[PDB]
Amino acid sequence: GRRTLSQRKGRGSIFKSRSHHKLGVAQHRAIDFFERHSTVRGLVKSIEHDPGRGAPLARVVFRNPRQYGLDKELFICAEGLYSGQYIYCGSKASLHIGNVLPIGQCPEGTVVCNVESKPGDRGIIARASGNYATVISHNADNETTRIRLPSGAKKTLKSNCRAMVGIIAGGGRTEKPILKAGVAYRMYKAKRTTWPRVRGVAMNPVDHPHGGGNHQHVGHPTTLKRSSPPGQKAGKVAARRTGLIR
RNA sequence: UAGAAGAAGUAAAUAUGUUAGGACCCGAAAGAUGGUGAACUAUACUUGAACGGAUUGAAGCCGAAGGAAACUUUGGUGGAAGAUUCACGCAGUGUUAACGUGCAAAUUACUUGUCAUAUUUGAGUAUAGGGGCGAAAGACUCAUCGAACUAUCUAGUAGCUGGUUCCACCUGAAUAUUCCCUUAGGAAGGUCAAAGUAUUAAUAGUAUUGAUUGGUAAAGAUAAUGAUUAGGUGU
RNA sequence: AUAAACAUACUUUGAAUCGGCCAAGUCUGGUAAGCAGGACUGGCGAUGCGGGAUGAACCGAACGUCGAGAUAAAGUGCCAAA
RNA sequence: AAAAUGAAGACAUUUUAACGAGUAAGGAAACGAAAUGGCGUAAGGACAACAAAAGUAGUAAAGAUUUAAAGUAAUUUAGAUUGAAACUGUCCUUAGUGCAGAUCUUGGUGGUAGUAGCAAAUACUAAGAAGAGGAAAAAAACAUCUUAGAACUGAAGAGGAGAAAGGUUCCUAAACAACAUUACUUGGAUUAGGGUGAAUCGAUCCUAAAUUACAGAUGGAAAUCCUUAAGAAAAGGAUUGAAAGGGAAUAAGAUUAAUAGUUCUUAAUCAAGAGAAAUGGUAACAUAUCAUGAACUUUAAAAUGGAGUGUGAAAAUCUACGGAAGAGUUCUCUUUUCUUCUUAACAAAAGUAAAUUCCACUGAAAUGAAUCAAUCAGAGAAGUGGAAUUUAUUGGCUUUGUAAGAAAUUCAAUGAAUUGUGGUAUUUUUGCAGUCUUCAUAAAAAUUAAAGGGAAUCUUUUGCUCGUACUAAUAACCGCAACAGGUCUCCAAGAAGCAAAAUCUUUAGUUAAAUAGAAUAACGCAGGUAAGGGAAGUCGGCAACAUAGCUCUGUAAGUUAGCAAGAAAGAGUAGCUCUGGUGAUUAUCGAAUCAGAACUUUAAAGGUUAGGGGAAUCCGACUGUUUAAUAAAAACAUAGCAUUCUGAUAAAUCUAAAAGGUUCAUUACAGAAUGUGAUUUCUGCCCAGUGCUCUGAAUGUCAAGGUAAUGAAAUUUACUUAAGCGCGGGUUAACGGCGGGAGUAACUAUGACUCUCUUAAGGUAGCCAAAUGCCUCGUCAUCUAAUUAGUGACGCGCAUGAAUGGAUCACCGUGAUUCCCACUGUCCCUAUCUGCAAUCUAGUGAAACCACAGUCAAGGGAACGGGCUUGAUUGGAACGGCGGGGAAAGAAGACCCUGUUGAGCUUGACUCUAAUUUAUCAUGUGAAAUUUUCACUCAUUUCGUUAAAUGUUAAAAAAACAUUAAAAUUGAAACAGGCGAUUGAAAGAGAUAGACGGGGAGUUUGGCUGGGGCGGCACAUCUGUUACAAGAUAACGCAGGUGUCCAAAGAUGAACUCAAUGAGGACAGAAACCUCAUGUAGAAUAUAAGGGUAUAAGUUCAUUUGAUUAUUGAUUCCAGUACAAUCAAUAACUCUGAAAUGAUGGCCUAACGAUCCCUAAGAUUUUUAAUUAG
RNA sequence: GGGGUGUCAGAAAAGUUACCACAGGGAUAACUGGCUUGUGGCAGCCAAGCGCUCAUAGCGACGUUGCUUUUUGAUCCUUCGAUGUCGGCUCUUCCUAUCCAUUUCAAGCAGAAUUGAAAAAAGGUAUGAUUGUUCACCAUUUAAUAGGGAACGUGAGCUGGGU
RNA sequence: CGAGAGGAACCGUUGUGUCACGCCACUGGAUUAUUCAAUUAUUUGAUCAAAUAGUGUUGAGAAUCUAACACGUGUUGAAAU
């Protein structure tokens, strides 16, 4: 048959990201001595709206500690930040909302966000709206600490991985029911080309494996092995279970 | 069962037959390989352009009256909605109207619908052939799409259809049998023609006489195997 | 007994063909069929001519170009020779 | 065919006799008594006046047209005419050698046929001019130009201009052969000239989506990737990308046959050049350059959605007062109706605005201030006084310079006159202020300015390159064209009206845009009306009719409480003369809007524009999308609901590969993959089967490898190995599924109830003759006079049913169905009106189709003749209609079947394959347990930065600033052979091996057949019969049979006689066992049927293995091939019998099988060599 | 010799196309026509009986002989380089196996209403609800509301309801 | 005729329906004699007179055509069956 819609998605055609009005890459600043063995102070100049993402972005401004000028950064807002607030980033920073601390200095039970999976990689985990990761325990024997990811999974990271103390702003975004197809159309203004999704059973046998006959149905089980080739991998993949959960 | 038994073969020009090659001439739907295309249409992005008149009246706000309170009744203000309609436009529901060698290789008239946010639209730009694009009809990808266009392989193959060019003279057929992936076709064989021989235990789709073979027509039915209507005699 | 020397025996090479159809003092399946399928022979196909008004097969009889006569099937009131 | 003659005659000899039809097919050449005979086309080698000028030809070749002759024919010969330079006859040789067909190719030409047509876009007329081109017994029409009449587009135009595209189509002159469906003096047509002027408009400059280089990386290759990451490359990152984004700077008048923000006059602007460092104000802030301001850093501008309301200013229209000039009307009036009364870029500052934001004084409550709405205040309202910015250039409007000298309107014959002031009116444009809305927040750079810091100590010149004409469309672009189709924009008057609607008009444009004139038939296309009845027409109210604006009253069931709703329904509306309400300025001035009252009439929305309404059922929730060119929908989307995987070095996924690419400028409120389709109510039972999964088991089965053994070695053998499958569990909002019989309640039904077969579970809640029910037009009500229709019920429901979603409908729908009211030519049943055609004429002028053609009946025939046979009957040429025929035209039937012809799609069809997966190999160091587990980093992976303090020693009050160092190489500490982390000898890419893999590639899907399919095997095969007394022999003809069975059921010898019947014998009888008699097979013989058999071929007894080896010759199917079977002998060794004999499987007719490949048995009877003796 | 090809002189082989394509076919089906007439329709002969008596007013069993092509069968002769395939609407003609009107005979014909039969096809034979329907069934009206053919009459005559 | 219930026919007279042929007097319908009149919108300065809205529209509307809507004729005679 044809190449299904999932195959056509990996080619980088019209399915490219609609990132033209985006503000930029949101991350911590690059690690240095003044962050490893001191604290640098940042000023939250403004809080802006980055298209395509649900959380506001803070236009933080630091001072260059080795040369003359400014280090205009772009952080992800923690809930409660306000314009003109001072935020301190470093190993000796105080445990306040918005401060950037290595994950080893946070007491067990601290709620953090924008955590680095690897030291110095400028933020990976807990970046969506209203999300956060909790610190579970420390292990000074091998300099590793345990955190609980927003998916519930537990992850062990190095004790010098940085994080922002608090909650990502914009929580409760997905609790408001979209009511109209027009509203969902505007949701993907700064996203990829995915929205109007035709059911595979409404397709033809050439287009999709579900492309059916005289009655709209599937015909074969929709739970498939992980090793299925691209093209026939349509439906539920490696499904340990199905049906409504109890 | 091949051979020998006082060697016959060879060469070249023709004719006929078999075989391979374009193969008596014309004919597929297809397959592969390499290139050209988004000036039509499909979707996406960048940068521009285009809402005039009415209908209805959501929160929010203000007065009056009633109330212990919660608040309620009533009159305004406000101008929301993928709200209702008209217009410039656009589409194509009906007439299954006109036309149907047309104005037109899809148009015209009235009617109908729709007529700014899932809107309409120009330019630039991106996506290309077992690929793209698709609010999904196998739809669209330059009047070409259930796999575009163009050139080469390629005069592709065809047991199938059509055609196959001067005269006179002589001879003149076939539908049995065996085998086939065989049943619209082949090979062995029968019928036929043309060449070339042999003095030749090498004549007969006939009748007669003679010795035979057979089990058909007929015939039989307490003659064998069966089928079937009755009438006497005896126990 | 009759016939047979352009008799007889062939040898070699090869063409086309194996869709058939009709008749009947014949048969089988079928109610039956201008149906389907067979035995024997003769025909049409490959075939014109005279007759049946006309007709692939029926009847007479098979064909170089003509003249004259006797005929065959069948006919002789007119079309139409008698 | 036979005789006779026979070197040359000639006619392919002479005589006699017999014969001669023919499709497919054959008879090549030569061959004297000739093994068929000849004609024609073209070229090659010879021959052609025999006596030394040797075929024909300017005294007319070839060719063409005909007249005659010869030949059975193919053809040849000659004359005449035309033609004017080459050609012919015979013999061999050679071949691109003979045409009526191929829907044949190319070219030309007929009938149709002077036929169909030259009918959308309202429309032309008179006089004159030019011209060959309005003549004439009306030849009724006449192209271009001027004037007059009459008209249309109607200012979202048939107007004035651009982008794309076109490319000279632009202007003028000469000229009309061709072209614009007649004509043309016209033309976007022919010929020849002319025409496009920029410092200010654009391109050029910048960047957006995106695009492309050197080096690097990848690739067998072409080439691909990377775009600043990999680089000794580029303070920081290369090229291209916009005539609609950003952008230094120009206007008015005049001018040309044509160019003008481009030329001329006048008047401007811009850029690049040349000739210890200021005041004022309390403050917000202000000063014709002034009044210094480097490196470095920051801020702002360029540069930012949309809606709606209010309002400032300008312009257009309208209007008030005063006029000046011209024009129209005027025997009826009209102090009247119409036109003109204007002003640029750039600057100035008499006078004077609206809105917003700040500053100073003061301190608000009895809270005030304010808007159409809002909104605001002790982080300070209101008040008073100030400052700033915006308002199409300076500074918004009037005004001024430019500047009246221009331009407009008149007058005179170049010269003269005038060029006030307003509006609480409408529209457009351009700004401003707040309000609303987003799970949408609505570009970048070139370039410019300011700030922080304090390093250093007016005149004039020039402004280059390219585009510039014209159309921009009912004739310049794309559709074959002057095509009713398509194609992005700017400016935009009056009436009337809610309206940029319909209708009419002014400025501008045009009267031609594929020809007309006469007549006024039929049938048409477009627009209409109609008596009485009112859907009776019809599949169906299809088409048409009908309602239609505004004001007031009134408005149901149902409902998601928002709607339904313009529900439904009723009344009013004209003209004229009046009355009253709604304000501003302080009596004057002004706005369209509402209400009311007399009177009149032809009783009033209706010229134009302008909803038909109601009661139900089904589907989809809605707005939206869809098969360009027959399907617009119930289909797709949708929001909502639900499920699966993934912690980013991941999931999905593109690529041959890749420091490769997409979601991802991302991070579970995320990314990817699916089903159902709003809301309400609810989603029942089933894990057996197939999927998926497991956090799971070991010693069932499992590869290449590894190890070990024997052997001279290859080889062989044994043991051990991962995933996978198997074993066990989970999962259905995973694929899916969700029974049968019988009996029983005081009449008749029905069966609450038991019985028992059975499943993984037995269809649960619901719903129903449903868009789902065969029977079926189900049964009962209701709708109608009448109901295969609709609706409401019943439900053992062929074959309803729960996210393949079940039930439910409020609003909504160019969706499907039924019924009412109203209205009507749908109909009873047709009449009639208009325009354009059709008819005839002048000019002009095709196409489809065509074997030849064209009166009937019957017969026969290929079973439906125009032709043939027999009759009926006919006068030649035809015009307007017409739709019976020509089995009319269009198209190698698209339905069905046959091809050993395909293609799309599907699947544990066969054979493979990319992706996925598992094991082994590919040697980093240092150790411990029985190779595994450890520790490190050094290859390797994944990352981050300006490779910016690594390692080891040493010593949360404040949205503000931080840089170019003083001082004495320090100030500002040293070293490591690690830029910093992460993984790490594991993972990746390679090879080999196992699994999985319709994601993908290639191919196949027998035959016979009263069409094919389903059924059956008449396909290999035997018996009886059809079957016709030799042989052969049909049907999907009839009655049946085979794919075996047998160490005895083979061989032999001997003995015996069978089935049945009668008569006897204790139990014993109809049937037990014994005896006699009769007994032609009526028994038995493995089997289907038919044959054979009595001292047997049957039963019993006994021996036995001939059911063996080797070699020949025949018979049956037969093609006289193979296989198979049937026989006759010979040479061995044997069995049985006294022996003759018999025995090479079964009493006979069926019981079966090639090439290649695999796998067993056999080849010692004999021949050699060497060595002794002769 | 054995291992086998059963499609048995012996390929290694699953479906579906209503999206379909090509070479062909009347060697071959779906429609008319043609032969046949089982089936359908109509008509006869005999006379066991019914018809209160009476085989034949009216019927006529058990048997038996025909005709028709208006049903469906049976066949495959023509058409596969195409004969436009149902019904309805409009219109003409033809058959008689006559429904009415005309003329007659018979009856178990008293009258009226009827029933059987002969001459006769010149003239008439309707309006609607439901269904695409042919067919059917209802409600009326009429003197009667008969049955059929013409390529199952009639698509360059219409419609497009069904297929 | 019949017990009764019920219950005809021939001649004669008069009408209706349909079919066919006609016809325009009376009744009705169409009507671009854009006839006569009225009137909405636009434009002629107003009155008069018109024009435009492809026939602006409405009322009456002759002629001509026509009726299933008006009205006439086919009641008609001999012979042979």
CSV table of N, CA, C and O (backbone and C1' of nucleotides) in Angstrom, one decimal, chain E residues 110-145:
chain,number,residue,atom,x,y,z
E,110,A,P,-90.3,-20.8,-14.3
E,110,A,O5',-91.7,-20.0,-14.5
E,110,A,C5',-92.4,-20.1,-15.7
E,110,A,C4',-93.5,-19.2,-15.8
E,110,A,C3',-93.1,-17.7,-15.8
E,110,A,O3',-92.8,-17.2,-17.1
E,110,A,C1',-94.8,-18.1,-14.2
E,111,G,P,-91.7,-16.1,-17.3
E,111,G,O5',-92.2,-14.9,-16.4
E,111,G,C5',-93.2,-14.0,-16.9
E,111,G,C4',-93.2,-12.7,-16.0
E,111,G,C3',-91.9,-12.0,-15.8
E,111,G,O3',-91.6,-11.1,-16.9
E,111,G,C1',-93.0,-12.2,-13.8
E,112,A,P,-90.1,-10.8,-17.3
E,112,A,O5',-89.5,-10.2,-16.0
E,112,A,C5',-89.6,-8.8,-15.7
E,112,A,C4',-88.9,-8.5,-14.4
E,112,A,C3',-87.4,-8.8,-14.4
E,112,A,O3',-86.6,-7.8,-15.0
E,112,A,C1',-88.4,-9.7,-12.5
E,113,A,P,-85.3,-8.2,-15.8
E,113,A,O5',-84.3,-8.8,-14.8
E,113,A,C5',-83.8,-8.1,-13.7
E,113,A,C4',-83.2,-8.9,-12.6
E,113,A,C3',-82.0,-9.8,-13.1
E,113,A,O3',-80.8,-9.0,-13.1
E,113,A,C1',-83.5,-11.2,-12.0
E,114,U,P,-79.6,-9.4,-14.1
E,114,U,O5',-79.9,-11.0,-14.4
E,114,U,C5',-78.8,-11.9,-14.6
E,114,U,C4',-79.1,-13.2,-14.0
E,114,U,C3',-78.4,-14.4,-14.6
E,114,U,O3',-77.0,-14.5,-14.2
E,114,U,C1',-80.6,-14.9,-14.2
E,115,U,P,-75.9,-14.6,-15.3
E,115,U,O5',-75.9,-16.2,-15.7
E,115,U,C5',-75.6,-17.2,-14.8
E,115,U,C4',-76.0,-18.5,-15.3
E,115,U,C3',-75.4,-18.9,-16.7
E,115,U,O3',-74.1,-19.3,-16.7
E,115,U,C1',-77.7,-19.5,-16.6
E,116,G,P,-73.1,-19.0,-18.0
E,116,G,O5',-73.6,-20.1,-19.0
E,116,G,C5',-73.3,-21.5,-18.8
E,116,G,C4',-73.9,-22.3,-19.9
E,116,G,C3',-73.6,-22.0,-21.3
E,116,G,O3',-72.3,-22.4,-21.8
E,116,G,C1',-75.9,-22.4,-21.1
E,117,A,P,-71.5,-21.4,-22.8
E,117,A,O5',-72.3,-21.6,-24.1
E,117,A,C5',-72.3,-22.8,-24.9
E,117,A,C4',-73.3,-22.8,-26.0
E,117,A,C3',-73.0,-21.7,-27.1
E,117,A,O3',-72.0,-22.1,-28.0
E,117,A,C1',-75.3,-21.7,-26.6
E,118,A,P,-71.2,-21.0,-28.8
E,118,A,O5',-72.1,-20.6,-30.0
E,118,A,C5',-72.4,-21.5,-31.1
E,118,A,C4',-73.4,-21.0,-32.1
E,118,A,C3',-73.0,-19.7,-32.8
E,118,A,O3',-72.1,-19.9,-33.8
E,118,A,C1',-75.2,-19.5,-32.0
E,119,A,P,-71.1,-18.7,-34.3
E,119,A,O5',-72.0,-17.7,-35.0
E,119,A,C5',-72.6,-18.0,-36.2
E,119,A,C4',-73.4,-16.8,-36.8
E,119,A,C3',-72.5,-15.5,-36.9
E,119,A,O3',-71.8,-15.5,-38.1
E,119,A,C1',-74.6,-15.0,-35.9
E,120,A,P,-70.2,-15.1,-38.1
E,120,A,O5',-70.3,-13.6,-37.5
E,120,A,C5',-70.9,-12.5,-38.2
E,120,A,C4',-71.1,-11.3,-37.3
E,120,A,C3',-69.8,-10.8,-36.6
E,120,A,O3',-69.1,-10.0,-37.5
E,120,A,C1',-71.5,-11.0,-35.0
E,121,A,P,-67.5,-10.3,-37.7
E,121,A,O5',-66.8,-9.3,-36.6
E,121,A,C5',-67.4,-8.0,-36.3
E,121,A,C4',-66.5,-7.2,-35.5
E,121,A,C3',-65.0,-7.2,-35.9
E,121,A,O3',-64.5,-5.8,-35.7
E,121,A,C1',-65.2,-7.8,-33.7
E,122,A,P,-64.1,-4.9,-37.0
E,122,A,O5',-65.4,-4.1,-37.3
E,122,A,C5',-65.3,-3.0,-38.3
E,122,A,C4',-66.5,-2.0,-38.1
E,122,A,C3',-66.5,-1.4,-36.7
E,122,A,O3',-65.6,-0.3,-36.6
E,122,A,C1',-68.6,-2.1,-37.2
E,123,G,P,-64.8,0.0,-35.2
E,123,G,O5',-66.0,0.5,-34.2
E,123,G,C5',-66.8,1.7,-34.5
E,123,G,C4',-67.6,2.0,-33.3
E,123,G,C3',-67.0,2.1,-32.0
E,123,G,O3',-66.3,3.3,-31.8
E,123,G,C1',-68.9,0.8,-31.8
E,124,G,P,-65.3,3.5,-30.6
E,124,G,O5',-66.2,3.7,-29.3
E,124,G,C5',-65.6,3.6,-28.0
E,124,G,C4',-66.7,3.2,-27.0
E,124,G,C3',-66.1,2.7,-25.7
E,124,G,O3',-65.7,3.7,-24.8
E,124,G,C1',-67.8,1.2,-26.4
E,125,U,P,-64.2,3.8,-24.3
E,125,U,O5',-64.0,2.6,-23.2
E,125,U,C5',-64.8,2.7,-22.0
E,125,U,C4',-65.0,1.4,-21.4
E,125,U,C3',-63.8,0.7,-20.9
E,125,U,O3',-63.3,1.2,-19.6
E,125,U,C1',-65.1,-0.8,-22.0
E,126,A,P,-61.8,1.1,-19.3
E,126,A,O5',-61.5,2.5,-18.5
E,126,A,C5',-61.7,3.7,-19.2
E,126,A,C4',-62.5,4.7,-18.3
E,126,A,C3',-61.8,5.1,-17.0
E,126,A,O3',-60.8,6.1,-17.2
E,126,A,C1',-64.0,4.5,-16.5
E,127,U,P,-59.6,6.3,-16.1
E,127,U,O5',-60.4,6.9,-14.8
E,127,U,C5',-61.0,8.2,-14.9
E,127,U,C4',-61.5,8.6,-13.5
E,127,U,C3',-60.4,8.6,-12.4
E,127,U,O3',-59.6,9.7,-12.5
E,127,U,C1',-62.4,7.5,-11.6
E,128,G,P,-58.1,9.7,-11.9
E,128,G,O5',-58.4,9.6,-10.3
E,128,G,C5',-57.5,8.8,-9.5
E,128,G,C4',-58.1,8.6,-8.1
E,128,G,C3',-57.1,7.9,-7.1
E,128,G,O3',-56.3,8.8,-6.5
E,128,G,C1',-59.3,6.9,-7.1
E,129,A,P,-54.9,8.3,-5.9
E,129,A,O5',-55.2,7.6,-4.6
E,129,A,C5',-55.6,8.4,-3.4
E,129,A,C4',-55.6,7.5,-2.2
E,129,A,C3',-54.3,6.7,-2.0
E,129,A,O3',-53.2,7.4,-1.5
E,129,A,C1',-56.2,5.3,-1.6
E,130,U,P,-51.8,7.3,-2.0
E,130,U,O5',-51.4,5.8,-1.6
E,130,U,C5',-51.2,5.4,-0.3
E,130,U,C4',-50.8,4.0,-0.1
E,130,U,C3',-49.6,3.5,-1.1
E,130,U,O3',-48.4,3.9,-0.6
E,130,U,C1',-51.3,1.9,-1.0
E,131,U,P,-47.3,4.5,-1.6
E,131,U,O5',-46.7,3.2,-2.3
E,131,U,C5',-46.0,2.2,-1.5
E,131,U,C4',-45.8,0.9,-2.4
E,131,U,C3',-45.1,1.2,-3.7
E,131,U,O3',-43.7,1.3,-3.6
E,131,U,C1',-47.0,-0.2,-4.0
E,132,G,P,-42.9,2.5,-4.1
E,132,G,O5',-43.2,2.5,-5.7
E,132,G,C5',-43.0,3.7,-6.5
E,132,G,C4',-42.6,3.3,-7.9
E,132,G,C3',-43.6,2.3,-8.6
E,132,G,O3',-44.8,2.9,-9.1
E,132,G,C1',-41.4,1.6,-8.9
E,133,U,P,-46.2,2.8,-8.3
E,133,U,O5',-46.9,1.6,-9.1
E,133,U,C5',-46.6,0.2,-8.7
E,133,U,C4',-45.7,-0.5,-9.7
E,133,U,C3',-46.3,-1.6,-10.5
E,133,U,O3',-47.1,-1.1,-11.6
E,133,U,C1',-44.3,-2.3,-9.6
E,134,U,P,-48.6,-1.5,-11.9
E,134,U,O5',-48.4,-2.9,-12.7
E,134,U,C5',-48.0,-2.9,-14.0
E,134,U,C4',-47.8,-4.3,-14.6
E,134,U,C3',-48.9,-5.3,-14.2
E,134,U,O3',-50.1,-5.2,-14.9
E,134,U,C1',-46.8,-6.3,-14.0
E,135,C,P,-51.5,-5.4,-14.3
E,135,C,O5',-51.2,-6.5,-13.1
E,135,C,C5',-51.3,-7.9,-13.5
E,135,C,C4',-50.9,-8.7,-12.3
E,135,C,C3',-51.9,-8.8,-11.1
E,135,C,O3',-53.0,-9.6,-11.3
E,135,C,C1',-49.7,-8.4,-10.3
E,136,A,P,-54.5,-9.1,-10.9
E,136,A,O5',-54.4,-9.0,-9.3
E,136,A,C5',-54.0,-10.0,-8.4
E,136,A,C4',-53.8,-9.6,-7.0
E,136,A,C3',-55.0,-8.9,-6.3
E,136,A,O3',-55.8,-9.9,-5.8
E,136,A,C1',-53.0,-7.6,-6.0
E,137,C,P,-57.4,-9.6,-5.8
E,137,C,O5',-57.7,-8.7,-4.5
E,137,C,C5',-57.1,-9.1,-3.3
E,137,C,C4',-57.1,-7.9,-2.3
E,137,C,C3',-58.4,-7.1,-2.4
E,137,C,O3',-59.4,-7.7,-1.6
E,137,C,C1',-56.6,-5.6,-2.6
E,138,C,P,-60.9,-7.2,-1.7
E,138,C,O5',-61.0,-6.1,-0.5
E,138,C,C5',-62.0,-5.1,-0.6
E,138,C,C4',-61.4,-3.7,-0.2
E,138,C,C3',-62.2,-2.5,-0.6
E,138,C,O3',-63.3,-2.3,0.3
E,138,C,C1',-60.0,-2.1,-1.2
E,139,A,P,-64.8,-2.3,-0.3
E,139,A,O5',-65.1,-0.8,-0.6
E,139,A,C5',-64.6,0.2,0.4
E,139,A,C4',-64.7,1.6,-0.3
E,139,A,C3',-65.8,1.9,-1.2
E,139,A,O3',-67.0,2.2,-0.5
E,139,A,C1',-63.8,2.6,-2.2
E,140,U,P,-68.4,1.9,-1.2
E,140,U,O5',-68.1,2.3,-2.8
E,140,U,C5',-69.2,2.8,-3.6
E,140,U,C4',-68.7,4.0,-4.4
E,140,U,C3',-69.4,4.1,-5.7
E,140,U,O3',-70.6,4.8,-5.6
E,140,U,C1',-67.0,4.3,-6.0
E,141,U,P,-71.9,4.2,-6.3
E,141,U,O5',-71.8,4.6,-7.8
E,141,U,C5',-71.5,6.0,-8.2
E,141,U,C4',-71.0,6.1,-9.6
E,141,U,C3',-71.7,5.3,-10.7
E,141,U,O3',-72.8,5.9,-11.2
E,141,U,C1',-69.4,4.9,-10.8
E,142,U,P,-74.1,5.0,-11.6
E,142,U,O5',-73.7,4.4,-13.0
E,142,U,C5',-73.2,5.3,-14.1
E,142,U,C4',-72.5,4.5,-15.2
E,142,U,C3',-73.3,3.4,-15.8
E,142,U,O3',-74.3,3.8,-16.8
E,142,U,C1',-71.2,2.6,-15.3
E,143,A,P,-75.8,3.4,-16.7
E,143,A,O5',-75.8,2.1,-17.7
E,143,A,C5',-76.7,1.0,-17.5
E,143,A,C4',-76.2,-0.2,-18.3
E,143,A,C3',-74.9,-0.7,-17.9
E,143,A,O3',-74.9,-1.6,-16.8
E,143,A,C1',-75.1,-0.5,-20.3
E,144,A,P,-73.7,-1.8,-15.8
E,144,A,O5',-72.5,-2.4,-16.6
E,144,A,C5',-72.6,-3.7,-17.1
E,144,A,C4',-71.3,-4.1,-17.9
E,144,A,C3',-70.0,-3.7,-17.2
E,144,A,O3',-69.6,-4.7,-16.3
E,144,A,C1',-70.0,-2.9,-19.4
E,145,U,P,-69.8,-4.6,-14.7
E,145,U,O5',-68.9,-3.3,-14.3
E,145,U,C5',-67.5,-3.4,-14.1
E,145,U,C4',-66.8,-3.2,-15.4
E,145,U,C3',-65.3,-3.1,-15.3
E,145,U,O3',-64.6,-3.7,-16.4
E,145,U,C1',-66.1,-1.2,-16.4
